[PDB]
């Protein structure tokens, strides 16, 4: 279903609150994003890890140069956090992603996996900043 | 769902400070910050 898959969709507004929070390669790795390719067609890709690009770009108020190593079945390349769209996974895009996953051979994540992963972002959002992370963030 | 937003001292940049947290700005890092104007009906009489 597309509705259950949009629960872990990391929109463009949520990523602005974890630009310098540690454990970025643990809570983010697992969710899906609607990266814009470009005309209005979109392709859902899996978050394999985290990379850092040499180009610095501004995204509204803040500004980040980090990348996002994505993959859609087999075709993989470097992307940016500015091309991500806030739209939800449509039926056509959902079917396209399902077909790509079936063709690539990657087993579809189980429903319980998404159910237990969606809570990660929720528990990270309300995380108290009591440790020594503000110093690294400001640096 | 009000996280008690604040305004930094010199940066004048909004910050979300909750209870049991240090009083510092999201960037640079200072120790001074003020609050934002209330949302009440501030009505005066031009007398």
């Amino acid at each position: 279903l597309p509705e259950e898959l949009n629960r872990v969709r990391l929109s463009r507004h949520k990523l602005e609150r974890w630009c310098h929070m540690p454990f970025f390669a643990k809570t983010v790795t697992g969710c899906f994003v609607r990266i814009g390719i470009g005309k209005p067609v979109y392709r859902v890709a899996e978050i394999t890890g985290v990379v850092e690009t040499a180009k610095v770009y501004q995204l509204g108020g803040t500004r980040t140069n980090k990348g996002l190593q994505l993959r859609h079945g087999n075709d993989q390349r470097v992307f940016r956090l500015e091309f991500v769209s806030n739209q939800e996974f449509t039926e056509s895009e959902f079917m396209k992603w399902k077909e790509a996953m079936f063709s690539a051979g990657m087993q579809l994540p189980t429903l319980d996996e998404i159910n237990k992963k969606e809570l990660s972002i929720k528990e990270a959002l309300n995380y108290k900043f009591n440790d020594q992370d503000i110093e690294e963030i400001v640096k | 769902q009000q996280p008690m937003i604040y305004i930094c001292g010199e940066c004048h940049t909004e910050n979300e400070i909750k209870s049991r947290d240090p009083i510092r700005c999201r960037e640079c890092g200072y120790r001074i910050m003020y609050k934002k104007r209330t949302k009440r009906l501030v009505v005066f009489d031009a007398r």
Binding site: K14, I35, G38, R80, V84, N86 | -
Partner: peptide
């Protein structure tokens, strides 16, 4: 205050660049 999108703020594309 999770995501005040209200659509969005004109999202750029990859091939457009």
């Amino acid at each position: 205050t999770s995501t005040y999108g209200r659509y969005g703020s004109q999202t750029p594309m990859y091939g457009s660049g």
